[PDB]
Subunit: 393 residues, 4 copies
Amino acid sequence: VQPTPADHFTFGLWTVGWTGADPFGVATRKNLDPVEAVHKLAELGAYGITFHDNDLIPFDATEAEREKILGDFNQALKDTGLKVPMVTTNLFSHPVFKDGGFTSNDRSIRRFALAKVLHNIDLAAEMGAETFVMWGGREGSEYDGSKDLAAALDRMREGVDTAAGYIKDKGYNLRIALEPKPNEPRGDIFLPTVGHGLAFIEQLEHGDIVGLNPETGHEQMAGLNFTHGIAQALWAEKLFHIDLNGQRGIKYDQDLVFGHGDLTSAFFTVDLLENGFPNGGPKYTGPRHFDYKPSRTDGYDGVWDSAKANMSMYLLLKERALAFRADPEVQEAMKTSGVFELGETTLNAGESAADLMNDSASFAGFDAEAAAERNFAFIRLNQLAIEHLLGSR
Amino acid sequence: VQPTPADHFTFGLWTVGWTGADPFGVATRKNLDPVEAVHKLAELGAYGITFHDNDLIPFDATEAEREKILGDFNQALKDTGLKVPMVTTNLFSHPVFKDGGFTSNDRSIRRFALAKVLHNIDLAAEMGAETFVMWGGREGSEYDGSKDLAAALDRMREGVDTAAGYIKDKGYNLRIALEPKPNEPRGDIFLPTVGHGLAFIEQLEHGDIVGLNPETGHEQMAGLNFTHGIAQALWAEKLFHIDLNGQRGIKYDQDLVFGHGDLTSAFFTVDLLENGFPNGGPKYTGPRHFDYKPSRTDGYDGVWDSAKANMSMYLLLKERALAFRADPEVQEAMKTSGVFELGETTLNAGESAADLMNDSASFAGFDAEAAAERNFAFIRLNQLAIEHLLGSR
Amino acid sequence: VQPTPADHFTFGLWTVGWTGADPFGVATRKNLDPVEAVHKLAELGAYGITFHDNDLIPFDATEAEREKILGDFNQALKDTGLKVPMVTTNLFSHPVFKDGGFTSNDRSIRRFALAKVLHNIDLAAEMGAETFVMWGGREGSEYDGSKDLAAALDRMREGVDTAAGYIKDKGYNLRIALEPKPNEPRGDIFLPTVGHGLAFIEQLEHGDIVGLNPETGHEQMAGLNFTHGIAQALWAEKLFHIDLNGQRGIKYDQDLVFGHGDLTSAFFTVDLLENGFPNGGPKYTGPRHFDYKPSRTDGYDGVWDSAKANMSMYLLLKERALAFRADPEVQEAMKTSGVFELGETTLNAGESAADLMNDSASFAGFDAEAAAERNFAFIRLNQLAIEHLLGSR
Amino acid sequence: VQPTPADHFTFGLWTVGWTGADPFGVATRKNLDPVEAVHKLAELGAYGITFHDNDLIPFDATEAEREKILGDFNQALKDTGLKVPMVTTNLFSHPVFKDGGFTSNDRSIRRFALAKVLHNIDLAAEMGAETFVMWGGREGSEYDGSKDLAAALDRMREGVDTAAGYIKDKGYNLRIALEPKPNEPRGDIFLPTVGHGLAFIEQLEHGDIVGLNPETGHEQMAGLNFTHGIAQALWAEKLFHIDLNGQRGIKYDQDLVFGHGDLTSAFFTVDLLENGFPNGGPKYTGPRHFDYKPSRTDGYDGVWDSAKANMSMYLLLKERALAFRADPEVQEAMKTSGVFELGETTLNAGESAADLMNDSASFAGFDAEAAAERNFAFIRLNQLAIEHLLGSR
Ligand SMILES: O=C(O)[C@H](O)[C@@H](O)[C@H](O)[C@H](O)CO
Ligand SMILES: O=C(O)[C@H](O)[C@@H](O)[C@H](O)[C@H](O)CO
Ligand SMILES: O=C(O)[C@H](O)[C@@H](O)[C@H](O)[C@H](O)CO
Ligand SMILES: O=C(O)[C@H](O)[C@@H](O)[C@H](O)[C@H](O)CO
Ligand SMILES: [Mn+2]
Ligand SMILES: [Mn+2]
Ligand SMILES: [Mn+2]
Ligand SMILES: [Mn+2]
Ligand SMILES: [Mn+2]
Ligand SMILES: [Mn+2]
Ligand SMILES: [Mn+2]
Ligand SMILES: [Mn+2]
């Protein structure tokens, strides 16, 4: 292992700072000081730290307290060299956000959420963040008639497009990244998966600077294939940031360390981030952000153990995935299975729809029964990936 | 109840024609003749019938057999007055489609699937169908390294855009509707949910004539809110057709009658189709297609019972949903909950992002603690919908 | 439908007292005085109230304080007539319980947990409770090597049999009801479904006074049929108590009002509680207790509304379920479908295994193809159930 | 890793013989001769073979035919040395079984089903099988009013105890293993998880020779922890047989190769089969049987590859799991985390309930806040497990 700043491992302040309060209990750990957080993270090899406004500045802080807090925060960063690649806003914890921020049924709450976002964009720019994340955790319902579903999407669009136009207007060097989640805390959250968030961006006025922030556990809560979903985000040129962690099944958001959930899927997620596609195409080159929470049963030694473990897991997987694609038995297994063949266009250069209809050999004279005998050998190809993952090859 | 042709209830030939073979067993019923199917459906009050190419014409039929089959098929339609509003292609049952049609790793299978589609578009136009459905049931994988994920999306786009351009080229009065499904028969299917299919259409060249065909059970297999998902399809002006049925949970595709799954959700799905949105907006005005399968434990009297039951359920729900929105106690409950308030824009006419930042009353001077006391009364609003559904109000 | 004490509607103090704090936010409501809870519940028609030791008496309460609180609560009960049918222990909120109470890895903690339970049994006995519920919420793990799994079950048995032995020794009229939950707060909880609960009971020294307390949402969190699960509990004569609420899918514990989740499943649970089994069998006669949470979006008028909605939902489903079984049309459908034939023993009186194998009629000359023609008509029977539920009959 | 008969790897004839037909398509492979299956499995290192009556002898086979087939199969076994450790009955493919075998609503069908089982017990006894498996796949319903649920369990008990009584009367060395499945082919299956299976067993007249046959994918279809479920079965001494395969989430039964689904859960099941419980306890000693299906995409080279992959996966996980527990670092972590402390009884020898309540140290003066400071370090122990699994240690 041994991580270093060129690995681009970023951690949020609320991950290691998570004190243990869940739905059935109180915090099991003492609050973590943010200057301490910076120092410890930089000592482990992180490249940067991210935060929610209220993670650093209390909802209630006076103007004087904000500047005291920020001064110490900026010095620590200076002292350590940590960057601040992403900033986000808390629009879910205070009781006023109980029906949402942007899609709140109450118009005056909608304005208060939008103004909270606009000011946070100014702090984002001041920190040097390149990405502004939006997780609409209270946007949704428990009951289907609680909302006008079309109106709720117009209210999401107005917030996002107002914030985008403000970036554009001030010339900040920022992009917005929406973060999908199917449920929790709302029974149903608007833009529940990667797909829904991607579709939504194409209806915006300022869509050009809006992309996604997929999170491993979140798509797994709908039982979806995380690698498939980020592949589609990537393919669309919309993969602006990523949140890595672990989930074991369809249940509450667990936020385990990356690799302590669905292991095989974590492997293939690292193969796509690191290696990209077999035939060539787009590559994700942003930071590798860890959005997890250290288990409440463990003390502060577990908090720092857990932060090291995110980084170890990703470097271990990376290693096995570089060996796997490099392996000449794998390259030949891939060629047998048609992996490279999928990269050839279906139509010949210049062929038209009529052309192919009239080509006797692709339809009228085609031997469907003989084409069906092909052994794709997908099981053998899967067996080679796992043996590479078990460090057996 | 009593359905009639202006209700626009359509049924596929494979629904009532489904003989009972599942994964653990053989058919429990005798094949159903398609001319018989037409006659029985028209006697029950259906408006039209849909089919998959191989539902009517065997994979193997000679040219002479196709014309014999079609002649009897067109006469029956003539004799009864049934329309053929949608046509689809089978790209999943024959062994050649074991890795897909359009995204098959084998290039020669990809061409054979595209040519099967092109010819089926010609038959679609000849029948008077307005919608051409695409369900990519074998497009996917069991193993994550079986495919180049970016290449698979380029191969889906080439098929869909070739077929779209062919419609455009021939001037057919047809639209393509993609049908999402998360898994089954593939471990992971490409375009698994409504969101993924919507996003995918915005990357097409001929996107303008491509929309969706959501199916109740399919989004429920990812645990998603069906009403939320069709609302987003509707909002985007992409809801071209719909498949109605029932699913009880995350498991194999059940295809129960509409209303024999998640009942409350079926109610709200009928409220959106029939009533549209509380504040006004788009409306779905196409056919109400039933994609279900009569339970294998029941005989042919159950097949026709089951077909009547789809229609009864939808008319019963429609009735309760018209009474519910008409109810002045509901209208007032809605007004209390902020349902109409969500329709007001957040920003005042002419207000800019800077304006709102500088409005002291929406941020600096806002009383967050007092705005948080609002009783949204969503529980009471839900209680009134259910009492309307139980026929208690 | 107006509930009367006769109905046996019970509520926990923690249900209407839930303040609204979840994993992503703070409480939206002020604390509820217990005296008020009791008077309010008495005015809505409740039969009784239930609590957890610490819902009433704080963890750190001095003796003078405990005494005061108890005097206020017993006063309230005397004034209103409410019964206290069940009492339970909080073995999950204090940080000491982060790895469980009975199955904590630390033995000193296991001893405290058990001491905490014994004292609470004393109190339960003084309040006149007939049921003692155990919900082991922190018993389990996030990771598979965290526990010696055979030892976790011995530890569980030790605590549960010590509690049972103490009851018996003291002569208290109390029975223990175990409550399953598959996950949350722990990634995996021991004794996760009704089945595991019932199995464990059979390995107990004192299993005769140990039974189950199934909760609607908890079985639905694993996707199981709640009506099937309570029928196995009844069939084993082990249905001691029941917790009713609603759950809309596989996700975090929603604790919605009973009937506000899966509606048809609620219909059929009410039928089973009220009508018993179609061929006869045991019947459940305890409290109809609701363990739900008033959505956090709602203010105090919402709290009493939701409390009320639980009892109306139940009464409304009861009216329909009684009508359903009293309908002649329904009885005829049940007979046709073989619902009373299931009650006839397969063998003849004094017919042995050998006698049957040798009966030629049942095996060797049985006409399987003819027997397979039966039209069970399950679809039509389900249609009739739903038409009774929608009150269209 | 090369399997030897010593390993006890068993395979069903139906596993490598699966032809590829699913609900959406026809078979992609030709039928497998049983003689060949036996010789092929013998050359890969299998210990034994298993079958369903009709996998071998067709439903309609004449006596001369049955005799031939049996002569060919016994020849093969004599030639290769394969054992036949388990035999089962097909009570699900023929249309007669559309509502179940033992719990069919039709009594004539219940009698046939039971006759079919008795005859198969005879055969199982002649083949030298030690285990008789029952998988009640059609036992259940799609709709909640289809069954009298108490009567369904009496019917189940009647069949299972008749089969058990017959074994005992005939003096056969056979034990019955019940196999749970939550859904598919039926919407809801009776005895859906290990827990329900174990519970039912305790109501049986002859439960002493009746145990369980859990299948990896089946418990994962309800989202349960397979390793936790088999540990309860072991703890009750009721783990008679096991079926290994892989499942990637809550969906249709995938029947993937063991290790090709949830990898860490497979690691920890292998640890439990091989290392037993950390503090000691019962150990499983039967066959390691694989009930999977070679993906239908793959031709016959894929079939033998997949058969082989099952035994390599298992051997590879075994090597890692043995190394994991033998590591000193791991043993130290286990001790710290309190894995051996769980094995110490909570009470002291001859310490009663009263003695404990009165012990001041355990209750009244227990320092809960100090006890809560323990760092269980479960994260670090899980990290060590995964590093042994990836072979980076
Ligand atoms: O605990 C929290 O603060 C949230 O879970 C976040 O981690 C969100 O998932 C989102 O990434 C940023 O708001
Ligand atoms: O059984 C089938 O023929 C399929 O399940 C269809 O019903 C698809 O869902 C799709 O709508 C049309 O191909
Ligand atoms: O909210 C709570 O305090 C708990 O969730 C309980 O309600 C459990 O569900 C159990 O029924 C009683 O401990
Ligand atoms: O494919 C099959 O024939 C069945 O699914 C079986 O394999 C069951 O899973 C059970 O283990 C044996 O009846
Ligand atoms: Mn998360
Ligand atoms: Mn996140
Ligand atoms: Mn379907
Ligand atoms: Mn469909
Ligand atoms: Mn609950
Ligand atoms: Mn409960
Ligand atoms: Mn299986
Ligand atoms: Mn099996």
